[PDB]
Amino acid sequence: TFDAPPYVITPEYILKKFAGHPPSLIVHLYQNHFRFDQQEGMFQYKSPMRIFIEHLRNRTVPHEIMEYLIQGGVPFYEGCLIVQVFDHRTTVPFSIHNHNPYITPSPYVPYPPTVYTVVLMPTAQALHTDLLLKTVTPRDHMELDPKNIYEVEAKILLATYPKLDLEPTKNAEETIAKLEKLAHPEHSHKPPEPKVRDEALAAEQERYMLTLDERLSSKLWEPRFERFKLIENIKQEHAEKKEQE
């Protein structure tokens, strides 16, 4: 038997219960990009990884990278994730006349963070993804035969919600009061809003001056170092093979 969560999970309860334990994730925020603690690269806010920032804003578990999180062995605390957020966010380029200690002078110029802790709550999509991943993960062979999915989900639901409210009401006022009392913060938002839809000479001069430029004309940039990584992989494979011989 395992202790079951309360009806409404709050950051206070989770942070107090699991105090003294390592956080699940650490994220550093910069002016225009972010990264994790052990990540050497970076992610742009305009890249596909904006979903993680959206989930952080909404305090929801990111089910879309569940398999990646599993591969890394990230810890869960009653199905939630504790995340630490570090806030680092808070001449004449392309001129040949600039000086630099490694360059000749040139004759045309005269001469030379706040920290935060947050909690992300689970959702139904997360459980769906968990069961789906278990269905296609080899260990019978497979880790979970589909025909047992309903029983497994029933047992998980039984463990998650051990107590319900099974007391009948006698009139409409009692039902109204019960509905009012049981309201949930995550399901009490509001309905969304309807969806809605001098220098010209300088710009034209620049556009004219960039005529027939193959690459810069189209723009008028997210490096990933894929060729370098391919070279590294091939070099490692060749060296390892040479080890045998």
């Binding site: 206070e12 925020l29 804003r57 630490q84 957020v85 806030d87 966010r89 808070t90 920290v115 947050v118």
Partner: peptide, 21 residues
């Protein structure tokens, strides 16, 4: 824990909103 959510939630939300833009 440092920067506990219940008290600093508004500031974190504001900075996240600025980041998303």
């Amino acid at each position: 824990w440092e920067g506990a959510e219940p008290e600093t939630s508004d500031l974190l939300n504001a900075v996240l909103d600025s980041c998303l833009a």
